Structures are given as structure tokens and as C-alpha cells.
Symmetry: D2
Subunit: 403 residues, 4 copies
Amino acid sequence: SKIRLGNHLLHPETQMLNYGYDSELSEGAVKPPVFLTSTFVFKTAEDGRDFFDFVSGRKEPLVYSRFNHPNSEIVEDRLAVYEGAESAALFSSGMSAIATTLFAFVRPGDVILHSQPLYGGTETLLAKTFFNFGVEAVAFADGVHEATIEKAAEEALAKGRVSVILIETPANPTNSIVDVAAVRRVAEKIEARQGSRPVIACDNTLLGPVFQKPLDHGADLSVYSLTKYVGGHSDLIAGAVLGAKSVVRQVKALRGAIGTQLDPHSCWMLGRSLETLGLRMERADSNARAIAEFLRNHPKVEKLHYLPFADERSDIAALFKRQCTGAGSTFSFDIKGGQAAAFRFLNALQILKLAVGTESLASHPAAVDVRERIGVLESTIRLSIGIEHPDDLIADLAQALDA
Amino acid sequence: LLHPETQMLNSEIVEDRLAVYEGAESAALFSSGMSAIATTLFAFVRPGDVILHSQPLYGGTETLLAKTFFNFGVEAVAFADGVHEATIEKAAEEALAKGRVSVILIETPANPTNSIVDVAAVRRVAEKIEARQGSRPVIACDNTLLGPVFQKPLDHGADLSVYSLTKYVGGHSDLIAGAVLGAKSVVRQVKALRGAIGTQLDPHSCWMLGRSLETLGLRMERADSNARAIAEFLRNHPKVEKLHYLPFADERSDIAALFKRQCTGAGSTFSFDIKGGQAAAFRFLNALQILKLAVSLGGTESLASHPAAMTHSGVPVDVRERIGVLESTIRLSIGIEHPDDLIADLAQALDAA
Amino acid sequence: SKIRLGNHLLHPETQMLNYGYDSELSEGAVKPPVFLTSTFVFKTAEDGRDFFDFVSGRKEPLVYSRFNHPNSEIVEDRLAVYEGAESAALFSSGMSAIATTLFAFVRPGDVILHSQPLYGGTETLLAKTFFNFGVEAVAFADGVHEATIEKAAEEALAKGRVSVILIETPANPTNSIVDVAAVRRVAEKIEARQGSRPVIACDNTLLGPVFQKPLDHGADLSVYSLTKYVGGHSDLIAGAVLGAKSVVRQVKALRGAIGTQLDPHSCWMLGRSLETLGLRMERADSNARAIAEFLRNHPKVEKLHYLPFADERSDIAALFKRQCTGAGSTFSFDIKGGQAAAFRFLNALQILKLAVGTESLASHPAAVDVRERIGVLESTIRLSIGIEHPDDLIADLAQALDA
Amino acid sequence: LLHPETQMLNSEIVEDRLAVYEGAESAALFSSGMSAIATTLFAFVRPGDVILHSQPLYGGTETLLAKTFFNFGVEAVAFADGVHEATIEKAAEEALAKGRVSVILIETPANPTNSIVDVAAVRRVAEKIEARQGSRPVIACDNTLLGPVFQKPLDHGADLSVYSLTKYVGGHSDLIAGAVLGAKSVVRQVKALRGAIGTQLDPHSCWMLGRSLETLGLRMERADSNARAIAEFLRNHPKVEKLHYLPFADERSDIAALFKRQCTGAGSTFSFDIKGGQAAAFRFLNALQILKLAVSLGGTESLASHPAAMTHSGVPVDVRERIGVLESTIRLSIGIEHPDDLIADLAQALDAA
Ligand SMILES: *Cc1c(COP(=O)(O)O)cnc(C)c1O
Ligand SMILES: *Cc1c(COP(=O)(O)O)cnc(C)c1O
Ligand SMILES: *Cc1c(COP(=O)(O)O)cnc(C)c1O
Ligand SMILES: *Cc1c(COP(=O)(O)O)cnc(C)c1O
């Protein structure tokens, strides 16, 4: 399967259609009366001409059909293409990808060094299930600064062997971020004190694969819930892990032991979603930007947690600028008027829906010091922006802002 | 005023969404484009009728008229020039002479060279027919090529907007479907006949179409812009003789003026003529590595074919040459790949030609 | 694709798995770490041994996958195998199969000679849509006797050219039947008076393909709603037409003109249903027999319309005995006590469901001379028996019989 | 008393149906057999524990124990003879000596030669363990081979009945699933861990399994009777040395007596030894035209394989020979084809051997 056409290098959007294409064709007999069906493809122009000599009825009578049933291995290769990674493994869910990854690298006595906050399933996974297997966890709250990461890392090194550094960036809600390259420098030091480099696993669900590539900034694994945004549908549940071949091979071996792979039908559906990923992501992201501009300078908005509007001089702005190529579709704002106004705003929405991709959503993460440190107040509204028309989203936001 | 892309996020439910995208009052779904066409015709025609129609039509539609309807005592009269009211008028008079004109069946733009017909003109010709025979024919417009994003024929005089959704809306080779859109009462008549002859779209396909509609705006826009980029590249290529692409019609021609008033975009499908005849065409085709050799795969992947030796090989030469289908003509149907990959493929294949 | 293994001839149940099997395999690369997946098949034992040399990890590294995506042509060939027909065409529905069939053979001026009663969609198709294209219809009420068929046929020959004889046997409800061979003799005479033999199309939905094969008794086409019983699921809608190759080819040509073919996904689902057809049909039929024995001699049952219990000496019994190999799963009985008792019985059922395959169903066809001639009284209950345990069905029937 | 076949006509809904078929109080669905197994183990074991288990286990389960659980500080002790309480007892004592015995993991009958284990015996050994250590291990029985139709291990002392539904219940190569069945409170613990590690069965597969359950009784019965017919044919065939098929155990053996009390049928999978060693085995395999060469395709199609050179090639020879896996051993997994076609295929392939 080609990554080049002569000297020209193929882009990902092309590759979601072409990479492994030959392996998606089936053959059937040509039987009269001959009609062109929705699936027929021809190896050569002369083959097409011969087929239509039957269709025309000029001649009395093999034909290829292109269907969309890629193996898991081919959908993995396409993911890896999008990421710019060597290799990929698919999983039945985001949580099974994370769990299998942790099971492949940790042992009782170990410490998982991680960022904060993390997806709630990941926190409960570390706090209960891994704690019960003798695995400890130490958090760094501030992932922007190499110094705060270094500190937590000493705290971890004193509880035991650091076998994994687990980060999520940006994290939900409010998009605090971690400096992946700083995490990698700190892993090189950890390794000096202990004789092994921990595996750096980055939950890239929020911005990946289009707007952030953690493997290009020092991560060893880029991990996903493909359920959330890539898949584009609530009935498509999947996770993935991507990185270098030998590291991914170790997760695959664990994946086969514990049986966490993605089933073939879901692989087919994912192959179909990938076809429109670049379109869906780019629209979501442009929609989020237009909405962000509208909320900024809106009388009823206290604060916007939107990374492109961080101050030029801040460390956050500098990091975002070197680690990311876009802001994705998820962000938060604090409304003027606390809870009762936030609820009234929510209750008024007619286009954005209330829940917890594709469709635009609004939620209230609060529903005390922990929540405020994150920037989750009772005035806080989290928006996850889909692919509706931006004008229509903005209209709905204006009127709900009960204004 | 909500945009349709916003509103996309049962047969009955999907029909309602399609009606919203079209801006129509109601919609009926069918197992295929051809079944939508047939069911529509059988709802409206009876032995002794005449179907007046534009030219060229899709080949399945031609067969349907020439064979099946002809056997049921329904004749057909073509107009080759649907741009001018006067040529549409001449045809209608031939048709009135042969029987009751119950349907006017048009297809615009037409595959594979984007011939067009003036839907408002056809409507006026229909209102003359009504004056001269007592009843106004149903105007059905096969809007597959640009619809529903880039043309709304119900806004320009059609009574029904008819689709193969297989081609572009659905997105994939395994999703086949047809639709008929218009006023509840004209549509209701099509559904009754649907119920009788069992031409409904199956539920799973209705579900799959539902899903497809969510990305329809994005995919159509992208295919359209990929197509414009490719047409622009080809227009300057020294192995390309002629383009059949409506945005490139001279701003002063009647075609240009009609395109500007009836359409908001060119869609994904067009043709060009290569230098060096059929043998050059065939070498170009055989060197393609990204565009596949095919007629349709649902609209997501880009395809190339040779209409004179393939789809239009059974069409008489007078029709072919009138619409610009020559031995050097290549049809392209552009999907949503990166435009640079498509252009690089085209450029290397043109070097083989 | 094989119909024989050496000299041994393959049975249909085998063929639903094997016929076109090679065309259902896909190929993928063998990539480490190697695991056996749910889909792998091996061309040879040495190939299997080599694959597991990877799986065992003895060696570091092509493999075939068997999925179930048959072309429509292959599912058609499998149907034809079950029928003992040369050829088959698939359609989007039972009604599209019937309509396409009629459209392929009739023209304004023609008469459709048919049996009675017919499925309601077929009656409305003949009474409205074909009447409006100048096509007339003449019925024979008694399809057992060559004489009553002959009479209607004269009545038809006097209205115009008889191009189709359309029969449904057994018909719903009450399982009146038509003598297909008698219909064929009458078609040979029609042909003598007019110079063409009409096409004999037999709606075989009730007993086909296992318990009746109309093509073996003089029919030219065996036509189906595969929705009702073959498919085994309400979301699987399909029809078919089967017979000799040249006759089926004419229906296919019409099918391509009017676009009434069955879509690929439904073809796949049908391919899956066929795998269990022989099992489902044989259970349904044995269940119906056990239930029939129970209702017969049940105090509260007036009359049973069950073909195996027709009197030995009757023409009906003789016909059934030479035309059918079983009774299928659908029949009727008249309860003692008219409407109010029939309703009470229905309302009491807990296992059989009230509606209009796979699951057992009960309905009231009445809900006056037309209905009685058929043997649809207000006491009449129609049962369509599914694949539940016979003991459980009988239990539910006993108690509902409000007894 | 309703039969389960009657009651088959959300994850939650399908779980309830499976629980009815098993006769269990509750069920949890998983993405695979292996994920059902893993999730169960991780719900119950902690570092310092010992998993006592029967032998042979499925190869994925062996790996899971030998690698993953061993790395998490959980050791494992096997008993080779699960027919006799005394050998199960000896093993349990070895296990108590190494740590807390938290699970007893059994698999009966075992693939590919139908070794069996006495589930009531294991339960008594568990109650002795409880007396000697303070807590009674969870008994999990991998019932894939006969369940749920032909064995109910929860009726004979197991705490949990664990399945690869991929193998026989689901019916097809594209339906992979696992299950854990038992009391609501033991199951509830497995679901909590399921929620945490994300091992749930996807909705579409839950839907597909739903459908499969409707024909489960018919397909299992048919496979079982096809298998009995084939075993009967093979038993008299002059190129067949030995059968590994539980109905053919001597009515006086302990195996026979245990089979009669714990099982209601033999299911579809068994083995036989061919005369002429591996080279004859391989020629037999390569001549098959109806049975395919494979390990599993979901249970509908009949398959043949060579365990010593394929699935059990990594298993040490002492285990292999104890369970009767020899170079001459052929595994058959019988589907729902007509028995005459299968026997005709077997007979012609045996002539090549
Ligand atoms: C949802 C989510 C997960 C877990 O994904 P599932 O597919 O639902 O198991 C992990 N990480 C992040 C950031 C998430 O949003
Ligand atoms: C393909 C096509 C049809 C027929 O649609 P099907 O879905 O293939 O039956 C009708 N009209 C036009 C213009 C087409 O391109
Ligand atoms: C239902 C039925 C039909 C029509 O079938 P559809 O698949 O529902 O279009 C035709 N004949 C008979 C006997 C029927 O029961
Ligand atoms: C296949 C199998 C497993 C594993 O099931 P998967 O669904 O393939 O993960 C477990 N136990 C037994 C006995 C098996 O045969």
C-alpha cells in the first residue's frame, strides 16, 4: 500500500479512502442481463469498455466490487497515518485502551506519575482498580512548568518506581494543558535516578489527531477515546493507542491477553468515520472560533477559557503555540449571575443540547476548592461544538443568554 | 431562518429531513433512483399519454421510457435544446399532437457534460399546454447532479424534485436510494403508488441515509471545491482540448446566464476532452492511481471513466456529439480526497496520455 | 462453485454455507504480535502450522478471513438451490417482485387470469394500479377443479389476451389451494385458442421453498415475499422470483429498468437467514402439527382448517398429497361462541402475540358472503406458528381457550 | 415452567435473556470471552493470591494466568485430574501453601479432547479451603463448550458461568462476545470492574447477539446431532484409531458417570486420532472440501484442525499426551450442514489419508 505517488506524498484525507483499497475489493461473475451496479470498479479502461459491451447488449458474456470492510490492521494503519505515528492498536473503548496500556507497563510497587485533572474514568481507574493491585499514583497539578512536574516526580520517586507518566492535555473542562516536551525532559531525569525511563502516555482525545500530535513532542503513546470525536456517533465506541512499533507491540500483546480489541463491525464503521474526520474536525474548530469571538465582549460573559485568547506573554500561550495547531471544539465560559443565570441560559437553548460529537452540546460541570482551582464555578458552562451552521449556533446562544 | 446543516442533527423522519434540505413540503423515499422515477411516472401517466422530456437523460431513464412505458401505450418526445423556450415549445407541440402530455420529465444539469435546461421556461411551456389541452403536466426534475445543495428546482417551476440519492447524498457504494420531493398532495399521490408496487426504501438504508445527511453539507462543499480546483488545473493543461464545466461558460452566453440564475454551485461531476483521441484517453485512464475507474461509488471517492466507450456507448452519435461526448471525452466525478493528491494523480496520468 | 463432491450431490442446508464460499474470503497481512482471530481460515494444514509458528512465537513473520458478504447473484443462486430452480432474482419486497413480474409480461388489453383469494396487496395491485393501465382481471374461486379454472379462463379469453395466470397457494387465511398442474393444462388450452401460453406465476410464500415447489408441477415462476417467513425478521424485507433462466432473465431486465432489486445489505442479511431456514421451517411446521392435534378434539373448537386433517377421500386431500410435502406453520380454527369468545381467547394469550415469522402469532381475520365463502367467520382465529417450545405454545392455548 | 427457546422471542435486555437460558439470576456481557475472563479475575484477585485451576485451559487463559497475573503477584496452581476429588484436593493444598486461594478457575469439558472436571467436587474442595483459610474462593467455570444448553455449572456448585459467546452462541465470525452469569451480587462485582476497565460489549453486537439467541436452541441441537452422527461414522472407520467423544466413554468409567450427572449433551466439538501419524492427518485435512480448516467461525460451519501443530503447539508434551493430543489428533467443530454432506466429505478425505 502506497504512501507516495511517484515522488509525491499522499495526505491523510486521501489515505482514509485509499490506504488498503485493493484489500477492500471483491470479485463476482458477470451474468446477463448485465447492468452497472452501485459498486463496480474496473482495473483498466478496456475492461470498462468490455463490461459495457454487455450492458449495451452488443455482446453476450469477472467484475470488481468496492465495498467498505477494512481489517482492523488497515484501520489501524489509517489512524497511524493521520497521527504521523508508526503504529496503532484499536480497542473496544477509550477506557479499555487506557487500562490495557497501564496493565502492559505497571506492576505492584510502581507509581504512576500523572497530570490533573483527568477524565473521571481514568481517575477512578487509578484510585480504585490500580490502587488495589499495589500501584500508587502521584499528581502534578501544574503541567505547564517543568519545576512543578519535577517536584511531583520526586514525590513519586520516593513512593516507588515510576513506570508510567500519564498525561491528559488539554483536560476537561477549561483546557489546562501540559508541556509534553517538559514531561519528556523530566522522564529523562527520572531515568537517571532509577535506571529506566517511564512510558509517557498522552490522552489526546480533545485535540487529536488533527490539532495535536504528542508523539512529535516527546510522548511515547498517544491514547484516545475515538468514541468522543473521531467516531462521530454515540453507538460507535472505540479507543486507540499509537506510537512506535515496539511500544505498541507491547500493548498489543497485553490486548490479546485480556481481549480488549475492537470488534470487526466497529472497525468498519470507524473506517467510514475516518472518511469525513478532517471535514468534521475542521468545521467543529472553525465553529468554536466564531462562537468564541461572539462570547468574548458579550455583556453577559464573565470569562472565556479559550486557548487562542490567552495573553501573548503568558507561558500557557507560548506552550499552546508550540504544541498545538488549533483549539478544537471544546471550551468553557463563566456567565454573569452565578447558578440561576447559568441554568436559565441552559434551559433556554433550543439548538445546542444539554448532555455530557457532531451535534453541539452545553453542560454545567459543577452539577469546592477542587472545582474552583480547575475553574469550574457555578457560573461555568461547558460547550462542545459540533458541525451545525455557525450563524444558527450563535443565534441560539444570543437568545439563551437570556438576551 | 435555520440552515439545513443545522437541522440534520423511520422512512418518515428521514423524508422530513430531506424535505427541509430541499425546502420542500414533503418527501418520499424509494429503494433506488430508478424506482423513484418509475413510481413517479406510473402515478401520473396512462395509455395514450405522452411524456415530454429533455435530453440527454440518464440511461436507465431512457430505457424506462423507450421500453417499459412504450409497451404501456405511453409515447415520449424529446427536446434537445432545453435552454431556449422556443425549442422546448416546438417539442411540446409535437407531443400534444400525439396525445395527452401528463408529465414533463427533465434532468438538469445533465451527465456527463453538464447540459442544462431552463426550469422556469419549461413551466411556462407547461402552462401553454394546459391552455391548449385542459390539464397541466406534472413537471418532474431529476436533480441528482446538484441537489439539494446547489439547485432547488421546486423554486423555479418544477412540481417534483427527483433524486438518485445513491450517487452523491448517501456517500457509499452500499447505500442505494431514491427520493421524490414536492407538495404534500403531489407527493401523496407518489406514495400511494409506492405502497402498491412495493418500492419503499428499506429501514436499514433509511437509518444509514439519516447518518449520511449529517455530513452532506460538508461533503458536497468539499467535492465542489475539489472539482473547481481540478477544472482550473485542467483548463491550463496542454493535453486538454476542452472542458465541460458550467462555471467556465462565457459570462455572455445564454448557458452562463441560466446557470447563474438557477444554480448556486457546479457540484462534483464534469467532463474534459484530452488531445490524442481515444487511445490517449485510455492511457490516461490506465495510469490513474488515486482516482478509480468507475461511474459511481456514492460520492466520497473520486472516479474517472470514458463515456463514449462505457456509459454512453449505446447512445446514438447525434446525441453524443450534440452534448460533447466524443472519443476524447473523460468523465470525472470528484470526491473528498485532498485536492493535491487528485491533481498529482491527474498530472502524472496526463503525462502517460 | 460445486453442486457435487465427487459423485455425491450436496444438500441445500450445506449449500447455504458453501455455495460461493470462496468469493466470501478476504486476505490481510500477518503482522506481529500474531493472534488467531475469530475469522481466520487456512488453505492447507501446512499453512495453519506456519501461522501458529508465529502465534507460538517460535517464528517472527498473508491470512484469509471468512466474512459473510455474498453478492446478490450468490444469494440468488442459493435460493435457486433451495427451490430446485435454475435461476432466481431478488427484489426489494414481495410486492416489488409481484409488480415487476406483472410489468414484464402484461400490456394494455390483456387479462390476468387469477386465483382467489390473494394477498391484499396483490388484489389492490390488480384492482387499481393494473386496471388503470388497461389490464383486466378474471378470478376463479375454485382452484381445485380443472373445470372451474377452465370456465374462468373462457370468461377471461372473451375480455382479451391472457398473458399471465397468477395463483397463490395456499392462500390466506384457511389454506384453500390450487392445482398447479391443472392450471398448467388449462394454460396449454388457452394457448391453443390464442397462439401464446400465459406465464404461470405462483406466489409460494406460505409453503415455499421447503414444502412446495410450484415449478415442479407446471408453474413458470415461483414468487415470494421472503419478508414473511424466509427472512425471519421484520426489518428484513425482500421478495424473489424463481424459474427457468430465460423467463427469469425477462423479469431481471424489467427489474433493472424500474429499479426494484434488493440492496446489498439486505442481501447479506438474507444470506445469513438462509443458514437457519431449514431449521426454522421444520420447527415451525412440527410445532404447527402438535398444536393442530391439540386443537382437534378440544371441546371449545368448532372447526380446524388444517390441510393434513382433510378427509382422505376429498379432492383437497388428494391434491395436497401430490403437490405439497408439508403443511407449513399457518392455519385457522373456529372457536365455539362467536366473536366475544374469540376475542376473550385472543385477549388471554400471553405467549402467542396479537398482530398481522419466528414468533407465534394469533389474529382475527374478520376484524359477509365473501368472508364466509373463504371460511372467515367471526369465530375465526388465524395462527401463524413460530419456533417457541411446543409445550409452551399449547399451555398458552389451553389457558386462553378460557379454560 | 417456560422453556428458554420460548423466552428468547440494550446490553441489559440481552443479559436478561442469557440469564434465563442459563437459569441464573444475572448476566454481564463483555467485548470477548477473554475480556469476560480477565474482568472476572481482576474483580476477585489481589497480589499474593493464588488461582487454583483445572487443566487444560484455553490457551488465551493460560497466557493470561502465566504472564499478566503472574506479573501482578498472583500465582497459579493446576490440577491435571479434575475427575477425582483427591487430586483436586492435593492441588488445593499446594495452593494454600503459596497464598490466599481467591478463585478456583475451571473449564469443562476442555478443548479439544473433552477432558472433564467435577464441579460439585470442586465446590467441596472450595468449602475445605474456606475451613482452612477463612474465605471461600469464587468458583468460575468456563462453560463455552456445552453451555448454556447442555451443562449448567451454577446447578452443580459453580459461583459463575463464564462464556466465550464468539464460539457457538453467536453463530458467526463477525460476532465476538463474552459473558459472566451467576448471582446478582457476584455478578455486580464483575460489572463494576467492567465499568472501570471498559470491557463492555458494544451495542451493535448486543443487538446481533439478541438475534442469534432466537435460533440458539435449534442450532445447538442440530450441531450436536450432526456431531453424534459423525462420531458414530468415525468410530467404525478403519483409518480411525481412537475417538475423544464423551458419549463413547465406557458406561462403567468415572468419566461416564460424571458426564451423565453434570451434562445433558456432548455439544459439537471433539477429536479423533487418524492412523498413519501427522502426515496422514495433514493429507486428510488438505482433502476436505466442505469442512473448512479453522479453529472457529462462530459455530454455524463445520471445521477441522490439527491441535498439535496448530492451537496446542506451544503446550508442553506432557499436558498434550495426558489429554490425548497427539500428532495423529484431528479436532472437529461441527456446524449445521446436512450430516450426509459432512460424512461424504470426511469419507473421501479419509481415503486420501
Ligand atoms: C470519554 C473519555 C475517555 C473514555 O472513553 P470511552 O470510549 O468512553 O471508554 C477517556 N479519555 C477522555 C479525555 C474522554 O473524554
Ligand atoms: C444513477 C442515476 C439514476 C438512477 O439511480 P439509481 O439509484 O442508480 O437507481 C437516476 N438519475 C440519475 C441522473 C442518475 O445519475
Ligand atoms: C406479505 C405478502 C406479500 C407481499 O410481501 P411484502 O414483502 O410485504 O411486499 C405477497 N404475498 C403474500 C402471500 C404475502 O403474505
Ligand atoms: C475462544 C475461547 C475463549 C476466548 O473467547 P474470545 O471470545 O475468543 O476472546 C475462552 N474460553 C474458551 C474455552 C474458548 O474456546
